[PDB]
């Protein structure tokens with residue numbers, strides 16, 4: 001039984017390191033869907049720390065704008081510029097894309113050559129919700145193959161790192177193992193094929 005823990009909306013040197021510290025504590029791998037505007041010399045080391053620690057990096061666009069109604073040139077620029085900064089500091093190229101706001105269109109699918117991922121959400125962008133509530137949303141929603149969509153970066157209070165102290169032990173005790181997105185596809189025997197123009201919330205579709 002496999003799940004993929006994924007985190008949007010960083011990197012942030014302070015908030016992302018809180019998530020990375022919990023993943024180090026439990027020796028778990030995850031995937032970070034990063035925003036190009038945030039990837040720069042100040043955040044180079046923490047982006048590299050993801051790679052160094054066995055995590056994967058995917059693309060969450062240059063910024064925080066929905067992309068469904070953008071033009072092909074706007075889409076291409078946003079994805080390419082984000083890939084270029086990830087390559088500079090991480091030395092890797094994304095295979096996966098998470099659309100801002102999970103909003104898609106045929107034009108967006110047509111102009112992004114990455115595998116689109118969504119996933120099970122946990123209301124963890126709502127500061128009034130507690131660590132325990134965020135954990136309960138995840139634990140009760142997963143199944144074998146689920147992609148879990150959390151945020152490493154949001155306005156505070158943001159007790160997502162604290163939710164991991166419940167999510168990770170609970171799911172392990174139920175027989176789950178945590179994997180990156182690439183590992184999830186590979187271990188399930190699903191080609192990571194960007195010509196598939198569907199959004200994956202789990203693997204297999």
Ligand SMILES: [Co+2]
Pocket residue numbers: 008009060100101
């Ligand atoms: Co986002």
